[model samples]
Target: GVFNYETEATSVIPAARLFKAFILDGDNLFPKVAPQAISSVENIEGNGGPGTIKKISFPEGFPFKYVKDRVDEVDHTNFKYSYSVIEGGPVGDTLEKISNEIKIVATPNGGSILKINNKYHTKGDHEVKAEQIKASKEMGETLLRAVESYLLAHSDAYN
Candidate 1:
């Protein structure tokens, strides 16, 4: 019923900055930095700590409309974050839920290495292929690159 996978990406941005931009302050940063792909992030409940629910809406022409995720963990000291896809978008689309844990650690180059563990719970007997997970990995890296590019270009950002 549950499928597990891991994705890793290296970034020129520091671990704290990347974690803050992608997790803690993401509700504001995502829409500001990447307006085209991510239209908006709305806070549905809580204060972005654990138990908070946030909705991420993609722009028009995107495959999935929006996704609502519940925050499960947010550890500032360790640059770790975790959340679960509860409703809409990825959920109920052959998958019942998707739980993700992200860790960002400092690298020797003053950058960071992002490691993500994903648990995919399928709906009924729906099967998730290896190829699909591979594609997802590529997408994950692309997203990290996008954020890295933004941070690298704007040195004063997310400091």
Candidate 2:
């Protein structure tokens, strides 16, 4: 089923701040931000824009270990990003594939508001359990919070 699970999270950092950190320089900065789960990120194909593929490895003990992500959209205007998982992510049996698109904007108060949409595809007839969905979002949050901290601390970054 094309059952998409969408979630939104707010961030203390501005839109461009997180956008640059998460989308543009993710391969270089993610490990510095979140060292526990991520070991390294390398570009396996193309550049960093559309059609580019990135293979990100995890530290020891992390399940699924690695994920190959294909960049679909990376835009500076309105802080937009879209990527699909072509391989690995704890998905192989029940879930077939998943993709996430993030479009964030800075609010009037200078804070950032992001609405993330991840489309989930599965072969199971039953619905994706709440626990699985919760975990997926939480895992992503772990990286975002760490990246936010960096951007918050280093004001000169992502300009």
Candidate 3:
């Protein structure tokens, strides 16, 4: 069965700043803040546009070795980004692929509202358990929180 999840995160940073940090400067900022979770993000192929492939490496003893995500679409002006994980631990096991779409919009409070749409494609009739989904979502949220704290500390950064 296919599973879909939607989440919203608000940041005190501007939309453009958040977009730059999350999409453009992600390769650099991710590791600096969340070194425990992610070792590094490398652009394996193509520019930062559509068709770009990024290899995300995690620390040792992590669940999966590494995951390669292909940028499906990116719109800087609109602060929208989408990517699909094509190769990873669950790619051929319990899942076909996982896709994520992120959209950042400016809020009235001069911050940004990040909307994430996550889709999980299970293999065959395999049913994904609730705990698994919750765990994954919590992990993602934790990563975002780490980045948010980093950005909050560096007030002038990403602007």
lDDT of each: 0.82, 0.83, 0.83
Candidate 2 worst ten-residue window by lDDT:
123-132
For residues 40-109, write the lDDT of model 3, one tens digit per residue. Answer: 8888999878888989998998787788999999898999999998887568877888889999999999
What local lDDT does model 2 show for residue 53? Answer: 93
Q: Candidate 2 on 1-159: residue-level lDDT in tens?
A: 877777788888877777888778989888899989688998999977898999989899866689888999888887889998878875677777777899988888887888889887776765777777787788788888988888878888886
Which residue ranges in model 3 land beyond 4 Å of their true spot?
none
Tens digits of per-residue lDDT for model 1, 45-143: 998789999998988987779989899998999999899988887677588888999999999889888899989899787887886677568656655
Q: Report the alpha-carbon TM-score of model 2 versus the true structure.
A: 0.91
Candidate 1 residue spans exceeding 4 A from truth = 130-135
Models ranked on TM-score: 2, 3, 1
Model 1 residue 87 lDDT?
Answer: 88
Q: Which is superior by lDDT, 1 or 2?
A: 2
Best by TM-score: 2
Better of 1 and 3 by lDDT: 3
| Residue pairs with backbone atoms closer than 3 Å in model 1 (clashes) | none
Displacement of the residue 86 alpha carbon in candidate 1, Å: 0.9
- Indicate the worst ten consecutive residues by lDDT in candidate 1: 135-144
Give the TM-score of each candidate: 0.89, 0.91, 0.89
